[PDB]
Design a protein around this motif. Structure first.
Motif, PDB file in Angstrom:
ATOM      1  N   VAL A  76       0.758  -0.908   0.229  1.00  0.00           N
ATOM      2  CA  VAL A  76      -0.042  -0.107   0.504  1.00  0.00           C
ATOM      3  C   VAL A  76       0.964   1.153   0.330  1.00  0.00           C
ATOM      4  CG1 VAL A  76      -1.540   1.510   1.140  1.00  0.00           C
ATOM      5  CG2 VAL A  76      -2.077  -0.972   1.321  1.00  0.00           C
ATOM      6  N   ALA A  77       0.908   2.388  -0.982  1.00  0.00           N
ATOM      7  CA  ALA A  77       1.547   3.600  -1.345  1.00  0.00           C
ATOM      8  C   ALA A  77       1.541   3.855  -0.323  1.00  0.00           C
ATOM      9  CB  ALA A  77       1.234   4.288  -2.441  1.00  0.00           C
ATOM     10  N   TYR A  78       2.493   5.064   0.690  1.00  0.00           N
ATOM     11  CA  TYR A  78       2.842   6.589   0.589  1.00  0.00           C
ATOM     12  C   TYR A  78       2.127   6.078   2.724  1.00  0.00           C
ATOM     13  CZ  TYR A  78       3.321   8.360  -4.024  1.00  0.00           C
ATOM     14  OH  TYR A  78       3.250   9.016  -4.811  1.00  0.00           O
ATOM     15  N   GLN A  79       2.163   5.067   3.417  1.00  0.00           N
ATOM     16  CA  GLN A  79       1.921   4.961   4.635  1.00  0.00           C
ATOM     17  C   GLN A  79       2.013   6.095   5.735  1.00  0.00           C
ATOM     18  OE1 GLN A  79       2.899   0.477   5.510  1.00  0.00           O
ATOM     19  NE2 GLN A  79       2.336   0.203   3.525  1.00  0.00           N
ATOM     20  N   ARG A  80       2.091   7.253   5.220  1.00  0.00           N
ATOM     21  CA  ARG A  80       2.464   8.508   6.454  1.00  0.00           C
ATOM     22  C   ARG A  80       1.188   9.204   5.520  1.00  0.00           C
ATOM     23  NH1 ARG A  80       5.959  11.231   8.756  1.00  0.00           N
ATOM     24  NH2 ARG A  80       6.302  12.820   7.082  1.00  0.00           N
ATOM     25  N   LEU A  81       0.648   8.268   5.110  1.00  0.00           N
ATOM     26  CA  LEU A  81      -0.589   9.380   4.818  1.00  0.00           C
ATOM     27  C   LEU A  81      -1.570   9.433   5.843  1.00  0.00           C
ATOM     28  CD1 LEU A  81      -1.840   8.784   1.028  1.00  0.00           C
ATOM     29  CD2 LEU A  81      -1.369  11.244   1.807  1.00  0.00           C
ATOM     30  N   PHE A  82      -1.760   7.856   6.392  1.00  0.00           N
ATOM     31  CA  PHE A  82      -2.233   7.493   7.684  1.00  0.00           C
ATOM     32  C   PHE A  82      -1.921   7.410   8.645  1.00  0.00           C
ATOM     33  CE2 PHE A  82      -2.913   4.708   3.696  1.00  0.00           C
ATOM     34  CZ  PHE A  82      -3.509   5.036   3.170  1.00  0.00           C
ATOM     35  N   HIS A  83      -0.537   7.128   9.757  1.00  0.00           N
ATOM     36  CA  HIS A  83       0.192   7.773  11.083  1.00  0.00           C
ATOM     37  C   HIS A  83       1.221   7.888  10.165  1.00  0.00           C
ATOM     38  CE1 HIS A  83       1.749   6.803  14.507  1.00  0.00           C
ATOM     39  NE2 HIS A  83       0.520   6.537  14.751  1.00  0.00           N
ATOM     40  N   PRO A  84       1.697   8.745  11.166  1.00  0.00           N
ATOM     41  CA  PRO A  84       2.982   9.629  11.079  1.00  0.00           C
ATOM     42  C   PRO A  84       3.860   8.591  10.994  1.00  0.00           C
ATOM     43  CG  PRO A  84       1.532  11.023  12.711  1.00  0.00           C
ATOM     44  CD  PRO A  84       0.798  10.015  13.164  1.00  0.00           C
TER      45      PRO A  84
END
Ligand SMILES: Cc1cc2nc3c(=O)[nH]c(=O)nc-3n(C[C@H](O)[C@H](O)[C@H](O)COP(=O)(O)O)c2cc1C
Ligand SMILES: Cc1cc2nc3c(=O)[nH]c(=O)nc-3n(C[C@H](O)[C@H](O)[C@H](O)COP(=O)(O)O)c2cc1C
Ligand SMILES: Cc1cc2nc3c(=O)[nH]c(=O)nc-3n(C[C@H](O)[C@H](O)[C@H](O)COP(=O)(O)O)c2cc1C
Ligand SMILES: Cc1cc2nc3c(=O)[nH]c(=O)nc-3n(C[C@H](O)[C@H](O)[C@H](O)COP(=O)(O)O)c2cc1C
Ligand SMILES: O=C(O)[C@@H](O)c1ccc(O)cc1
Ligand SMILES: O=C(O)[C@@H](O)c1ccc(O)cc1
Ligand SMILES: O=C(O)[C@@H](O)c1ccc(O)cc1
Ligand SMILES: O=C(O)[C@@H](O)c1ccc(O)cc1
Lengths: 355, 355, 355, 355
Positions: A76-84
């Motif tokens: 899943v791309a770009y996991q910092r979208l969901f949590h720091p």
């Protein structure tokens, strides 16, 4: 949390609307997104009774490594979208649970940092317009200790994500593609336009069978083709030297109207006839769903959105709790179905039902 | 606009209720109208991966002309009902998009005016009680540069349109059948009665296979029979010298309970075995729907109601935007499905799913 | 009125609740009642095009008489429940429309009075505990000019009508079984009990194949067995000398869970292979439904509840309007399907669809 | 009460929420719970007509005893949860109705007390961690006059009951497992945890085919394996010397996603080919459902939840009324279907329908 559905509710509460939509959504009318769930709901298992369950094990051996469950965390791309903590949080939880974690080409933390967490990770590859960048990523992944290359083959470009288009979704300034200099394309805000989609069209080159061969020649690692749905493409994957495939419609995010992977899985398993590992994804939301996939012939499943729900809800601890819940549900379902091993679960029969 | 559904919402806002109903409605209980959508929604595509997409083209050759998409604008009577520029607006947009436009026998602007727009148009024929008027229309169409005769064969008379009956629908004074003197029948207002339906019963003679032969002998243009659903009628169409057929239930407006064309298409394509072009219509609402039709064997689709939504919403520019959106969706769907050409899309396999 | 559904709305407005429920309801959970509609809705017709429609006729010959439509009024007990003129109103309208009318054993006007209306009526028989009363009714019917005996074979006793039980339904004092002295059983009011059901258990003897033979030996009229669903019972009906059968689950009023007649019809038509007339009933609500039944092989249909809606709404004139509407819908559907005769309609093919 | 559904409404009114949930609920997403109903609703019976019904009997002979109906009361643990008289009330009503009653290993009144009620009861066995306790229970049951051992084979441990987990359900102090000293495990209150589930994991040993043989060698009574769904497990049950099986998914309470028993029943009946009695349960809610089960080949059904609804609503008298209602519905359905005996009902054919 007593079901995965508890986590989705938790994640909707905390995430910004446009980010929840980027996560939840599919392409077009979301027909394939919904069908992934419908397809699983129509499958019923014919359990066996009265078998020895004194040592039920959910473990598998896959790509040269023992995994605690027949499951890996999907790319899943770009996991910092969901949590720091993004990918580091998820990778740590996966490591601790004994579940493979798939590091993405579009990770928001560098692949080397995520690999340093440990847990014998996999690496997902997107083919880029400059081939050399993609082959360099493969070599970086291998040098960093990744154990398989999951080459995503269903994204010649990004699907039409109408939620993202309507929201004018773009990456926040603080989330970037950490494996690159990926430019500014995914951050520019344009009305009625998904910034990530036009970034993809600009950055990605369509992969072909020649690309697969270039990767296979560049690494000793097993190459796993993710996004296969046609039986003949599964057969060709084996002929091409793939160590596995993931039977998948990309979570309903790519071709809207693509058949669910779960609907092709049995036919694909029969056609490859043990020539490679056959994984499936799309809509796995419980241990019972894992059991269904296994009974249809899957070697293992990937799980995408629920892992991000858990990450959004409670970071690393959230992902840990999700994986513990899934582990318990898989053990429960297997035993109730008379299966002391995943191999026995693959020999279960199924029956289609209604709604 | 990011989907065709955006245009329907726009058109409902602007159009008078009775005109929106004339457009949207079907015959009887609207079973066939709904089934056209259901039928498409049940079809799933099995996409191919890893094929060369360096020159994806959505073009086809049909009836001696290159078209930009495997699509034409369906014949829709009385387009001035929806916008003052009526057929001229739609024809101009179709020309500019490289899409064939079907000029109607019941056009509200004369066929010669619409043909003068350019774009190599088709002409739709209704058989009239005086045969000579219908054959004169064919000759007018041919003289004006129309490139195919689309003979509608499913209207011996008009279906029972209950919305039109309940509304007491009649044409406004300012909308007429511009190819004729069509009399006053379609304008008279009678309660519980559709004025257009009793006009049709008065004006139309049922067409037969003899009528088809009379048309075929009167023109060098390809004759395309629109409204074929029975396999044996498709076979007979080929034997009769048709250059094409449109597999269609007339958008659910004729026999209520008629099978959707999309449900007969594969069987019909197999039976004609390349002997004529096989088009389909009814409920095409996206590029993905076009792809489904193509995968089931269609040479091309017709699109009706959505073109009128676009016309009502924003005139010529609206139709342009609709066609650009459809073009993008078709390109997107084809490429995601591994098809660099429409021919490759016709070789895709499909699988039925649920709801 | 532009559809039969208009009449149901009209009838619900005027009738007392418990009488509307006696009319509308079925047995048990009303599964079979609903399935009669579902079954028709799933059938789609494959229409034919381009056939000669210069003399479309909806007429049939059945039991030695020309009928204007492939339709008769079903036997419905106690028609004075719905309008003061009861059976006389319905019989007059049926006569005028050229449609056979089925006079009931439990008619609320005597069979001789209804027969005197004219129109070459049929007579429906229930087998009574004293056989001689039933055979006397047959002879009365024949003496009065009835042209067929419709022996109802699916009521060894009345089904469990939960609406009637909950309502404590009983016949009003002014409605009686006019062909008898039927006693007071159907008029007594008992809580949680259907008075008509306990009257039936007291009055009716279960019919057997011996009863059929007794009737066949007692009359020269064609004997038609109503309520056949099993293929072997249809075959045996022919062997027993029946001139027809009605494939029927009694409008969902008898066995709850009985298959709809429309679902057995094709198999039954094939098995009897022209040995008797094969009628069907249950849920016919339009000319298109008539066409579906015909395409599945029926000689004719019966229509029950809608005739009573029309009677309740507007008496004789209401029934006239219903029959005119049905006649128009049948003509419309036939012609749109390319059928100049009912025989041609029987040669139409069908296809099952979804919802 | 005119249907079983009347009793559920009555029971919801009176019972505490968490107890109603313990009764009503299933495992996981309750897919199998719902499917038990869906599966029955899709089956339609093809009734026979004109057969002799002068002596309709609903009786069967099973396990050496005549039963008044092809039905027994299913084993339901801890009946004092629903009414203070618990199992004694239900057993008395079952005795009076001539219906076998299944005494549970986890009965809240001792098995000897319940057996003393009379009525030739059955005894349900759970295999316990100390084998000797389970074999002692079998001998106690036999000594007390139980006539069959119903060995439940689908509970190696208890399923994941999310209603019970969310409610933190535990047995009240005044309800105990009266056949044992069962400890305090099922009474301790822990948040997010079903006390009965962790009690089961602690107390139950998974049964195997060896356990079945140990039971078969320890008693002269017929051994009936409850929870069989796989055809090969049914065959093996016969080979193992079982006198019967119950084709069952445990009311949707065990494996979520297990096929309904009703969906496996016909195939199982064919495979055992008279070698043992084949019962079914799950979702039987009417005499018509009993008829469906019989037509699919069942020797008899079990009924679970509705018996508890009746017990909760009105104690012994409630259960009596439920059994009288079911008896009437079974007689009604059989006769309407042309069946003078249960054997004739087993020879009925069925047809699948939709929704
Ligand atoms: C937000 C999001 C981002 C994704 N990013 C990628 C990606 O970079 N590479 C890839 O191969 N798949 C990607 N996927 C697809 C997943 O790997 C997987 O196929 C899909 O999520 C599985 O379905 P599930 O979410 O229903 O479990 C993504 C999915 C989501 C929801
Ligand atoms: C308002 C309206 C008018 C139409 N007029 C004609 C006509 O004059 N001739 C004809 O052959 N078809 C006519 N059609 C049918 C269309 O050509 C086409 O078969 C149908 O609209 C396709 O379905 P779609 O609207 O779902 O795209 C008409 C359809 C509509 C909605
Ligand atoms: C109120 C009512 C009374 C009926 N009375 C009889 C009867 O006396 N004899 C009989 O054979 N059928 C009787 N029927 C059944 C009808 O003949 C017929 O089978 C059924 O109504 C057809 O279904 P439809 O109502 O959906 O058109 C009755 C039906 C209704 C609704
Ligand atoms: C509250 C409850 C307790 C149960 N206890 C037992 C049990 O102790 N042993 C057993 O074999 N089955 C048990 N069952 C399962 C039933 O015997 C039966 O399989 C199921 O209830 C049948 O489905 P029905 O409730 O839909 O009629 C139980 C069911 C319920 C609802
Ligand atoms: O499905 C996705 O969002 C993922 O596969 C993806 C994300 C960004 C991107 O540029 C391309 C693909
Ligand atoms: O479907 C329609 O409305 C179109 O085909 C039509 C319009 C007017 C008319 O008189 C006959 C047919
Ligand atoms: O379905 C009915 O109501 C009808 O067949 C009937 C009416 C009264 C009666 O006593 C027996 C049957
Ligand atoms: O389904 C149930 O609840 C029943 O089978 C059961 C009850 C308590 C228990 O400990 C084990 C099983």
């Amino acid at each position: 949390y007593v079901s995965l559905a508890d986590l989705e509710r938790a994640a909707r509460d905390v995430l910004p609307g446009e980010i929840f939509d980027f996560l939840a959504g599919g392409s077009g009318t979301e027909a394939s997104l919904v069908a992934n769930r419908t397809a699983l709901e129509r499958v019923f298992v014919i359990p066996r009774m009265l078998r020895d369950l004194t040592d039920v094990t959910t473990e598998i051996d896959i790509f040269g490594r023992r995994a605690a469950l027949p499951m890996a965390v999907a790319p899943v791309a770009y996991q910092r979208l969901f949590h720091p903590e993004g990918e580091l949080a998820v990778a740590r939880a996966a490591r601790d649970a004994g579940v493979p974690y798939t590091i993405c080409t579009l990770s928001s933390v560098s692949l080397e940092e995520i690999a340093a967490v440990g847990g014998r990770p996999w690496f997902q590859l997107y083919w880029l317009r400059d081939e050399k960048r993609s082959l360099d990523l493969v070599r970086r992944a291998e040098d960093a200790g990744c154990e398989a290359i999951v080459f995503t083959v269903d994204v010649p470009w990004m699907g039409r994500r109408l939620r993202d288009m309507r929201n004018g979704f773009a990456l926040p300034e603080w989330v970037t593609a950490a494996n690159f200099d990926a430019g500014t394309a995914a951050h520019r805000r344009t009305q009625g336009v998904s910034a990530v989609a036009d970034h993809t069209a600009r950055e990605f080159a369509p992969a072909t069978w020649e690309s697969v061969e270039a990767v296979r020649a560049h690494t000793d690692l097993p190459v796993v083709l993710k996004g296969i749905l046609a039986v003949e493409d599964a057969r060709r994957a084996v002929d091409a030297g793939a160590g596995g495939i993931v039977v998948s419609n990309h979570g309903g995010r790519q071709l809207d109207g693509a058949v669910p992977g779960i609907e092709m899985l049995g036919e694909i398993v029969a056609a490859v006839s043990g020539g490679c590992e056959v994984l499936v994804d799309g809509g796995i939301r419980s241990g019972g769903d894992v059991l269904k996939a296994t009974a249809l012939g899957a070697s293992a499943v990937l799980v995408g959105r629920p892992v991000m729900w858990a990450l959004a809800a409670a970071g690393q601890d959230g992902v840990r709790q999700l994986l513990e819940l899934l582990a318990e549900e898989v053990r429960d379902a297997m035993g109730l179905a008379g299966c002391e091993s995943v191999g026995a679960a693959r020999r279960l029969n199924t029956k289609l039902g209604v709604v």
